[PDB]
Design a binder for this molecule. Structure first.
Ligand SMILES: *[C@@H]1O[C@H](CO)[C@@H](O[C@@H]2O[C@H](CO)[C@@H](O[C@@H]3O[C@H](CO)[C@@H](O)[C@H](O[C@H]4O[C@H](CO)[C@@H](O)[C@H](O)[C@@H]4O)[C@@H]3O)[C@H](O)[C@H]2NC(C)=O)[C@H](O)[C@H]1NC(C)=O
Ligand SMILES: O=C(O)CN1CCN(C[C@@H]2CC(C3CCNCC3)=NO2)CC1
Ligand SMILES: *[C@@H]1O[C@H](CO)[C@@H](O)[C@H](O)[C@H]1NC(C)=O
Ligand SMILES: [Ca+2]
Ligand SMILES: [Ca+2]
Ligand SMILES: [Ca+2]
Ligand SMILES: [Ca+2]
Ligand SMILES: [Mn+2]
Ligand SMILES: [Mn+2]
Ligand SMILES: [Mn+2]
Lengths: 216, 214, 454, 466
């Protein structure tokens, strides 16, 4: 079967360079064109360029001329995307693509390699409990995980015990650091009757803090 | 370059429906178009190449059509796995260019959100910051507006928002809004409010608290 | 010995179409045998020669045959900021035909091709192309492995390496028993010659109309070479397959290269990765050793033997003179892992310019004595120069040195009777294998039925 | 005493002569009963046989035409004699043999045709510059050897058809060199340029207007051109009584018969002239390259001496072809043809350094044997060819003709001709197997068993039907 296995997620500083790889699994990389595509949430999908690994000839979108350099080594059956002079806007997910039958199509995709550009150092999160204010049948608590780098973090309640009725929101970049929040909703007879704890782990800085939600 | 205008940006549909995504190009591309699928939090799979040709393995409920500069992707009888993102791509000319994408979402009955406001914790205040958090949970449809008010006056600087994907259980959406101030600025005022505007109510859903008071 | 030369069967195509240039037996999904006939100058839609193919039902009276229809229209595709073009005028569709299972493969070796990009071009060149048909279902596919999209300047900059622009893919063809199509492309790699192989099933499943440039991932092509012995060798002018390495799980290829090594000529036996196992060298320069190759076990030991035709071989005669008559070489495969040796037998033509050995057809066991037999054509032989086909019977020591039967052309002068030949198939179901003989110069095919031995 | 003539016990005069060339027959009436009529001629006269009644033919040979060998091949309306004698009468009785001679001279000052057939593909561009004065330079050196020189010119590239010819863009058809930085001629197969003439500045001036073309594949179409230059007698202008030199220059491999199928061409070469008024080979795109055997036939038929003047990178190739085309010469050509003048002079010397006898129309029952004398009176048995000769040398051959039995036809003639020569020796053979007395036979003689027999040569023979 045809599989494109890309390299792992990269975490680099602005102004540096990074080289992504795309290894052919189940076929010869020499067989077809290999393309590189950039994906961002706002900007969407953008074609970077292509290489013919049989000879090394390349094409590029003039938007990426200078930053993108696509190479290939038939020996390792792998294609490469070198990015240089990195910037916050180079933060994206990069895919290698090849066609099935049509010479010019874009049918088979690697899993994608995440790139993140930042000057932030490895910072541990600040975990804050969120208790309501001084009534109904349903009560909602929360937990705020602010100012950590890099991603990701794991958040649970009562160490995975309380799982249903929970909304953990995607992290957001707040001035080179990340912020994340999570809510939980139960009945009024449960809390403060039963101890609810917010368990946050940040394996990057190797920290596992737990804040018990206390009423006001 | 060739512009690829893909419509609609999203659609709310149900299982078993027949739906069509369209893609308009700034010039004729003579069926040199492919269709792509990206399932939530995953990579891409090719569906169609050269306008009408199914990629190997793709189910036959998918089909492509069109000509010149106007093309369509049709799914007859939607399956649960079909709720994902879809993109067109033209390869008539270099550089290859993509459409903006279409997200198929699950349709359901409208639901008002459960709003909850949370004052800054003791811990954060003793470090010099002050974050007011507002949760807006389990609503449909996805369109919603949050408005922060400090002493009755709207505030736009320092707001940070996050949304979840359509929830797997009830197919609703949820939102988190956070207003971060300094400790010094947080104490210059008394009333803190987040307002929620949804199509489920003409009046905005309002939740608030007063500093010092509890 | 026992072909019937009294009551023949004639099929005819249009005047000037070269009906009979190539032919093969075709069996449908029910086992009913028909004859597929190539006619490489058949007129197309624009009243221009493009070639054509006919599928002749077996009838003792013969007659006219229905067409096997293929798309004769030139194609254009604008894609990847390039313009792809096929050109079917004078492409010679039907210059080769071969049947396997219920599929027919008909090739147009001189189909031209070009790619345009702004002011540049690939150059308009004969890459050739093959057309595939499943007649009962109407399925159609194409295979054209030498089409590329590289511009002319790039070949110049890289010293014309791996240059497949003049392949003439389909010039010769054969299908393995397992259904791998093997194409001879004697113009490949700037006239060295190459072979292209792909499973028939993968050709159909990877083909879609209008794409023009597509990948057949299971395909395999032979290799360019820096060795001047291969330059202008037309490797792939003829092709065949057989069992030559003692391992029944592998199929070996037999490739004719009639101008190899400054027109000495050669035939090579390869494994299916195109690694060379043996090389037979021509005996006389310009004799076109390798013009035709045939594979069949003639001496009843179960080991495939090899026949090679050199239709322009000049025999030595009295007073230090030479006479172009043609020659056929027989090589018996030795027991176990050993090289093919010197020829076991030389068969030499008689008639000046008769081109004995221009075609060599396995007959199966014609007289049913336990040994397989062959027919050799001399398309300009016979005392009148009209053409002859000569039958040679197998025996324990190889082949008989004298023919058991000679078939004189029933057609007028210039018919090229015997230029194409096919045997080893019982078309009338009488238990004896029969012989079809093409005479493209007369636009006809003759069928000789084998009968009980008299 | 008795001998094979008497012991054989012959029945007739004819049977007597067939016993041995030494037997004779006596047709005289007054001969004793016991005495045989078939004996040695001496023994017959010893037994008082009338000399007139003796039948004893003797195998002989007498010349009929014996013109002297010419000292010069110059002048004359080709009244030049290179072979002597030109005609003899040969007489042979059964199982007998007679011998005769022939002289052959490589005549001095014999006319010469030189047709220059030139590769004009793109690598020969500097060759064209070198030979702009060839016509006059060649005339100066050949004047030392002959006073009747004619020269001519033709050129070839390859078949003007894909894939040999570039066919795109349209500009490439008018100028194959478009994608380089120059202009060259559209591709052509073979074009005749200059009919053989003694006006050598016509050669210079035609060459100065020639230019190269460009084709795709290294082997070229020169064999097409050799064929046309050979069989288009009137257009090329070969003379009847002259040495014919066809000078073929190239620096590349050559296309051969059955190559044409790469351009879709399958029609075999017909060996006929297809150069019309436009001076181009009109069958180039429709007829296959000729085979070696067909080239050989036509070169021999027209008495053309082919010279392969080729560069060192293909010398071995053309030497090997030369061995398959007997009479062909090979010389090493420089990369710019600067040495072609001496090559032609050396080739002309090699061509006229050999005399090789050929026999045409020899009857089956006749066998010949040859003793050769070349150099200085050195006899070489069993040989019919001389080598190492110079212009003006003369060689001779002794020939013996043996007849096996007596053939049905009593008069036949055959020819002894040196290869490439105009003159020849015609041998008129008469088989003397009959007796003169048979012409005056008496059918139904009343001497032979009451009219049941015929009386001839003094004996009785059973008549027809018995
Ligand atoms: C022009 O014609 C000449 C005359 O034939 C021709 O030269 C010959 O070429 C052959 C092939 O290269 C030479 O062959 C060999 O003989 C020697 C012994 O003298 C052996 O060493 C060689 O053996 C090896 O190679 C063989 C394959 O060629 C193998 O089968 C064998 O097992 C060995 O591995 C080989 O048999 C031959 O010696 C020459 N002869 C002369 C006199 O040079 C020449 O190549 C022709 N050129 C052109 C351009 O046509
Ligand atoms: O003669 C002309 O008109 C032009 N000439 C220009 C040079 N051409 C050279 C070509 C290149 C080529 C090698 C073959 C081996 N692999 C690499 C390519 N064979 O011959 C021949 C024709
Ligand atoms: C005939 O041959 C003999 C010997 O072979 C020779 O002595 C004699 O001179 C020859 N005569 C003629 C006329 O050739
Ligand atoms: Ca095998
Ligand atoms: Ca065998
Ligand atoms: Ca048999
Ligand atoms: Ca039969
Ligand atoms: Mn050349
Ligand atoms: Mn030169
Ligand atoms: Mn050429």
């Amino acid at each position: 079967e045809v599989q494109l296995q890309q390299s792992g997620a990269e975490l680099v500083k602005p102004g540096a360079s990074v080289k992504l790889s795309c290894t052919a699994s189940g076929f010869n990389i020499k067989d077809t064109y290999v393309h590189w595509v950039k994906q961002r949430p706002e900007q969407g999908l953008e074609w970077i360029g292509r290489i013919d690994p049989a000879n090394g000839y390349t094409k590029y979108d003039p938007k990426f001329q200078g930053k993108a350099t696509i190479t290939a080594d038939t020996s390792s059956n792998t294609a490469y995307l070198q990015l240089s002079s990195l910037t916050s806007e180079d933060t994206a997910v990069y895919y290698c693509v090849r066609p099935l039958y049509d010479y010019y199509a874009m049918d088979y995709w690697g899993q994608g390699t995440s790139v993140t550009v930042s000057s932030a150092k490895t910072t541990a999160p600040s975990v804050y409990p969120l208790a309501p204010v001084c009534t109904g049948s349903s009560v909602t608590l929360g937990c705020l995980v602010k100012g950590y780098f890099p991603e990701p973090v794991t958040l649970t309640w009562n160490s995975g015990s309380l799982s249903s009725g929970v909304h953990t929101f995607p992290a957001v970049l707040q001035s080179d650091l990340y912020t994340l929040s999570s809510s939980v909703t139960v009945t009024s007879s449960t809390w403060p009757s039963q101890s609810i704890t917010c368990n946050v782990a940040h394996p990057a800085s190797s920290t596992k803090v737990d804040k018990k939600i206390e009423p006001r | 370059d060739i512009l690829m205008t893909q419509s609609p940006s999203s659609m709310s549909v149900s299982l078993g429906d027949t739906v069509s995504i369209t893609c308009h190009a700034s010039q004729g591309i003579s069926s040199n178009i492919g269709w792509l699928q990206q399932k939530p939090g995953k990579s891409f799979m090719g569906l169609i190449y050269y306008g009408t040709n199914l990629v190997d393995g793709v189910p036959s409920r998918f089909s492509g059509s069109g000509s010149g500069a106007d093309y369509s992707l049709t799914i007859s009888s939607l399956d649960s796995e079909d709720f994902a993102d879809y993109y067109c791509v033209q390869y008539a000319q270099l550089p290859y260019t993509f459409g903006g994408g279409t997200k198929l979402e699950i349709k359901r009955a409208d639901a008002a959100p459960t709003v909850s406001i949370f004052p800054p914790s003791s811990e954060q205040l003793t470090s010099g910051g002050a974050s007011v958090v507002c949760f807006l949970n389990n609503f449909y449809p996805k369109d919603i507006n949050v408005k922060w008010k400090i002493d009755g006056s709207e505030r736009q600087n320092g707001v940070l928002n996050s949304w979840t994907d359509q929830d797997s259980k009830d197919s609703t959406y949820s939102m988190s809004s956070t207003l971060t101030l300094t400790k010094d600025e947080y104490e210059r005022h008394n009333s803190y409010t987040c307002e929620a505007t949804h199509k489920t109510s003409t009046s905005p859903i309002v939740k608030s608290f007063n500093r010092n008071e509890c | 010995l026992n072909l019937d030369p009294v009551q023949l069967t004639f099929y005819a195509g249009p005047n000037g179409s070269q009906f009979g240039f190539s032919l093969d037996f075709h069996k449908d999904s029910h086992g009913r045998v028909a004859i597929v006939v190539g006619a490489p100058r058949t007129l197309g839609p624009s009243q221009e020669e493009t070639g054509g193919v006919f599928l002749c039902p077996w009838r003792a009276e013969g007659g006219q045959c229905p067409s096997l229809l293929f798309d004769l229209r030139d194609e254009t595709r604008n894609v990847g900021s390039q313009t792809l073009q096929t050109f079917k005028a004078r492409q010679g569709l039907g210059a080769s035909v071969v049947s396997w299972s219920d599929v027919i493969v008909a090739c147009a070796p001189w189909q031209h091709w070009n790619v345009l990009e702004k002011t540049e071009e690939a150059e308009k060149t004969p890459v050739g192309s093959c057309f595939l048909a499943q007649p009962e279902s109407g399925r159609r596919a194409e295979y054209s492995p030498c089409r590329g999209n590289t511009l002319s300047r790039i070949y110049v900059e890289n010293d014309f390496s791996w240059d497949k622009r003049y392949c003439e893919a389909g010039f010769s063809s054969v299908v393995t028993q397992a259904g791998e199509l093997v194409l001879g492309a004697p113009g490949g790699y700037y006239f060295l010659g190459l072979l292209a192989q792909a499973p028939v099933a993968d050709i159909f499943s990877s083909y879609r109309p209008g794409i023009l440039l597509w990948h057949v991932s299971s395909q395999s092509l032979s290799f360019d070479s820096s060795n001047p012995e291969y330059f202008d060798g037309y490797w792939g002018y003829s092709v065949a397959v057989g069992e030559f390495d003692g391992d029944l799980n592998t199929t070996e290829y037999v490739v004719g290269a009639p101008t190899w090594s400054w027109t000495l000529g050669a035939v090579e036996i390869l494994d299916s990765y195109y690694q060379r196992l043996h090389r037979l060298r021509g005996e006389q320069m310009a004799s076109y050793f390798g013009h035709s190759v045939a594979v069949t076990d003639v001496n009843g030991d179960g080991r495939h033997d090899l026949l090679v035709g050199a239709p322009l071989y000049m025999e030595s005669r009295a007073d230090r003179k030479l006479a172009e008559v043609g020659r056929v070489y027989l090589f018996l495969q030795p027991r176990g892992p050993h090289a093919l040796g010197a020829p076991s037998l030389l068969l030499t033509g008689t008639q000046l310019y008769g081109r004995f050995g221009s075609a060599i057809a396995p007959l199966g066991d014609l007289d049913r004595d336990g040994y397989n037999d062959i027919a050799v054509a001399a398309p300009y032989g016979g005392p009148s120069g009209r053409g002859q086909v000569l039958v040679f019977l197998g025996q324990s020591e190889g082949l008989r040195s004298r023919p058991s039967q000679v078939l004189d052309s029933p057609f007028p002068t210039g018919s090229a009777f015997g230029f194409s030949l096919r045997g080893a198939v019982d078309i009338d179901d009488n238990g004896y294998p029969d012989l079809i003989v093409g005479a493209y110069g007369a636009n006809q095919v003759a069928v000789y039925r084998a009968q009980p031995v008299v | 005493g008795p001998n094979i003539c008497t012991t054989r016990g012959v029945s007739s005069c004819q049977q007597c002569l067939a016993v041995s060339p030494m037997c004779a027959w006596c047709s005289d009436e007054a001969l004793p009963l016991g005495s045989p009529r078939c004996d040695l001629k001496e023994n017959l006269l010893k037994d008082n046989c009338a000399p007139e009644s003796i039948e004893f033919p003797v195998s002989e040979a007498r010349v009929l035409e014996d013109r002297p060998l010419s000292d010069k091949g110059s002048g004359d309306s080709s009244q030049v004699t290179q072979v002597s004698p030109q005609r003899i009468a040969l007489r042979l009785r059964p199982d007998d043999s007679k011998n005769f001679s022939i002289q052959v001279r490589q005549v001095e000052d014999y006319p010469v045709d030189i047709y220059y057939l030139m590769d004009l593909s793109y690598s020969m561009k500097d060759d064209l510059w070198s030979i702009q004065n060839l016509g006059t330079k060649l005339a100066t050196q050949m004047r030392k050897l002959t006073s009747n020189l004619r020269i001519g010119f033709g050129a070839f590239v390859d078949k003007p058809v894909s894939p040999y010819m570039y066919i795109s863009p349209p500009e490439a058809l008018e100028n194959p060199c478009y994608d380089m930085k120059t202009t060259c001629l559209p591709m052509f197969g073979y074009k005749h340029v200059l009919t053989l003439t003694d006006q050598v500045t016509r050669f210079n001036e035609e060459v100065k207007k020639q230019s190269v073309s460009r084709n795709r594949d290294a082997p070229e179409g020169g064999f097409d051109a050799i064929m046309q230059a050979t069989v288009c007698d009137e257009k090329i202008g070969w003379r009847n009584d002259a040495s014919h030199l066809l000078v073929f220059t190239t620096d590349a491999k050559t296309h051969i018969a059955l190559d044409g199928r790469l351009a879709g061409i399958v029609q075999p070469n017909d060996g006929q002239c297809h150069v019309g008024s436009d001076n181009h080979y009109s069958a180039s795109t429709t007829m296959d390259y000729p085979s070696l055997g067909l080239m050989t036939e036509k070169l021999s038929q027209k008495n053309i001496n082919l010279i392969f003047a080729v560069t060192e990178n293909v010398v071995n190739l053309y030497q090997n072809y030369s061995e398959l085309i007997p009479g062909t010469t090979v010389g090493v050509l420089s990369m710019d043809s600067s040495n072609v003048l001496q090559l032609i002079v050396d080739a002309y010397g090699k061509i006229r350094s050999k005399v090789e006898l050929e026999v045409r129309d020899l009857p089956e029952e006749l066998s010949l044997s040859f003793n050769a004398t070349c150099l200085n009176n050195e006899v070489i048995p069993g040989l019919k060819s001389c080598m190492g000769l110079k212009i003006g040398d003369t060689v001779s051959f002794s020939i013996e003709a043996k007849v096996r039995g007596c053939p049905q036809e009593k008069e036949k003639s055959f020819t002894i001709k040196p290869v490439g020569f105009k003159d020849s020796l015609i041998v008129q053979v008469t088989f003397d197997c009959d007796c003169a007395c048979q012409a005056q036979a008496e059918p139904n003689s009343h001497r032979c068993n009451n009219g049941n027999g015929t009386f001839e040569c003094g004996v009785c023979r059973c008549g027809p039907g018995w």
